[PDB]
Subunit: 425 residues, 2 copies
């Protein structure tokens, strides 16, 4: 058999544009943790997960319990994660809404997934097979991703580093320009607009403008639940049939269900269906028609496959949600999406917004050609951890002065009167 001998949880941080969202605005650096496991016969499995204080704490408490364990026994791993979290109680019940790493409800799922992806990568190296083959084989050889557009300011407050190439985007012109730039460099066939920040009427106009500038392109809008139902309706009337799907315009299962019933539009979510019980409750109300998968908080890659199959059973579409991430997450997203027959929609990604120098794998930033990630025959995730690069971002983590993400606190540096509201509009 086989046994794990060394587990390394490494918190890191990397630069992030001043991206606007419903909560406020992104901080100069985004947190992350990098997982690396190693076996008695010298094989390495990589993992990537949330870096926020609560999530780190669990990862660090789990790691020490993993030495001398069979990497096939994911069931035992789950049991251990469940023991660790049960012993941590009580825990803070309100974290940052848009940062799943700070969600108490996802304590077990976040932690189990962090190591699950590493355990399977290990298994795949040992077998000399790409990761997707452990999951049942590639259904497709290229996974399409979408263009993740943000409204943004020119630069971060107090200029912590050198301003970015993109520049500000606060009008339909610059949004188009931002998209044009994205699609050229990466080849995306689908467009998503992060909304809930600028006035809704204006945010709608930015999508119309993308219709003209990019006809035949699937369009997605995501106010992250920051619009009331009344507003969600009025905006649906202006949008018509321009969207591929209408993602979390209004909060709550009941509000979503009422919105769909009244407008007929296909709704997607990553906020009202985030676990299996929420799926059960959604299905009973017909709240959503598409569910965004995310392996990071849904409890891993196999759990994501389980969700996809349930979505199929209940007549729901399957898409994919993202948080700022590097190469290990990207390959992980791609590998599981490549293995599920009914993931038609293009997966969301943050990759374009991350800097080329600040990647943690060998070979620099991974390639997205034709808006798709290629699934090669390289064993596991087909990735090697650049240790010098790791140390650099680990050290940047120590100096950034950030331990848990807060978009609300960050926007308060710009408007002092800013308070979290939901739904704002």
């Amino acid at each position: 058999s086989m046994k794990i001998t060394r587990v390394t949880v490494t918190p890191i941080a990397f630069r992030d544009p001043p991206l606007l969202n419903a909560s406020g605005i992104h901080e100069p650096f985004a947190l992350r943790s990098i997982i690396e496991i190693e076996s008695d016969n010298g094989y390495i499995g990589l993992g990537e997960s949330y870096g926020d204080a609560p999530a780190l704490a669990i990862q660090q408490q789990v790691q020490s319990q993993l030495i001398g364990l069979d990497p096939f026994n994911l069931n035992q791993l789950r049991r251990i994660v469940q023991t660790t979290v049960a012993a941590h109680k009580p825990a803070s019940l309100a974290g940052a809404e848009l940062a799943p790493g700070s969600h108490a409800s996802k304590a077990v799922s976040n932690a189990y997934s962090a190591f699950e992806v590493a355990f399977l990568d290990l298994q795949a190296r040992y077998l000399n097979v790409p990761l997707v083959d452990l999951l049942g084989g590639a259904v497709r050889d290229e996974v399409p991703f979408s263009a993740y557009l943000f409204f943004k300011y020119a630069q971060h407050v107090d200029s912590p580093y050198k301003p970015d190439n993109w520049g500000e985007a606060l009008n339909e012109q610059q949004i188009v320009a931002q998209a044009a730039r994205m699609i050229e460099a990466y080849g995306f066939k689908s467009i998503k607009l992060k909304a809930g920040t600028l006035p809704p009427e204006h945010e709608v106009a930015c999508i119309k403008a993308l219709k003209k500038a990019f006809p035949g392109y699937p369009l997605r809008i995501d106010p992250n639940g920051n619009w009331s139902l009344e507003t969600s309706i009025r905006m649906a009337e202006l949008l018509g049939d321009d969207l591929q799907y209408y993602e979390d315009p209004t909060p709550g299962l009941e509000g979503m269900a009422e919105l769909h019933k009244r407008t007929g539009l296909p709704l997607a979510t990553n906020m009202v269906v985030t676990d299996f019980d929420e799926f059960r409750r959604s299905v009973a109300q017909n709240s959503v028609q598409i569910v965004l998968a995310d392996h990071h908080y849904w409890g891993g890659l196999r759990d994501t496959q389980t969700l996809a199959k349930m979505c199929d059973t209940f007549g729901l579409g399957v898409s994919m949600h993202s948080n700022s991430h590097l190469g290990i997450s990207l390959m992980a997203m791609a590998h599981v999406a490549a293995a599920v027959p009914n993931l038609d929609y293009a997966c969301d990604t943050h990759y374009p917004w991350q800097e080329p120098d600040e990647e943690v794998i060998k070979g620099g930033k991974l390639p997205i050609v034709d808006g798709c990630v290629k699934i090669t025959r390289a064993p596991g995730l087909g990735l090697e951890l650049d240790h010098d690069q790791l140390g650099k971002l680990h050290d940047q983590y120590l100096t950034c002065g950030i331990r848990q993400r807060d978009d609300v606190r960050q926007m308060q540096r710009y408007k002092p009167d800013w308070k979290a509201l939901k739904p704002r509009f």
Copy 2:
């Protein structure tokens, strides 16, 4: 350089089956089954066991030829292949006669996928040197509990083509109690399931009482195979009080099962009204059943069974596993998936006590059941090897028995000429 399949061997067989009575009628002196052998370019062998009726074989055979030279990890390929093959095939079965587990035309893709899926995974496990369960995330338990599956039976098959079985007849409480005792003594089962909806329901109730009297603290269950009307089911519930752990399919249909539950609050189990994922959805909408008895053979294999277990957990339903008229291969595939599921709520179902000592296709003969359990070990894959001599022998008994499709209804007509497939009879 990917590992690849070189050889596939589908092999039909028949084994002595007792005169076991059920809702539909009575077992034939023989019962059919198919054995799957897979081999890889590097000499590893994966095993399978499935349905042995003519139309199933025909499907297995059709798919068999397509398998050579393909990556045994690429199960998604294997699925697309089974679908294409089934699409190029007429049903060739009347819907009224689809009465046995897995017989429904809709199960075509699932039965055929499951047949090979097991062998594909048993293959992977042999190549990895790990037990199969490890492919499925690891063993939650090392022992899988099972019940004693009790049947009413006649002493012998009419115009029998061999010596009568050693069990004798079982048509009253005394003979049933004795039949259970035999099984409990031999195998150590800690729970009991009676195959019902065969004799008058008042008589069958009395047989449960006698079993409860003879064996206290033994959880008791029945499967009347939907052969009781709603009113009968209700009258029986009254007479039984709380003698039973659960009732499996006492009354037919999603609507009847739901109504029965509403009217009594009793825990209802099924392997009739929830047999696939669409049925699961419709059941959950009506709250028809509280417990799903999975069966990897028709649900689509081992990974699909895990999906099902997870779905039951999600919707607050109990899960347990099941297999009928099967050999050791099935028993192990079932046990292994049963071993990887956290939410195993009840002892599993097996026919294995009925299979004759001399009629297995594996080295060692009949697998051990100690303390009413099956041990999961560190042996690679299923940890089983084909006795090619026993294989050839039972393939010959297939050729000579003259049964190509099971028919408990025709078979019963030899004892009672006026017999029809009534449901619910009582």
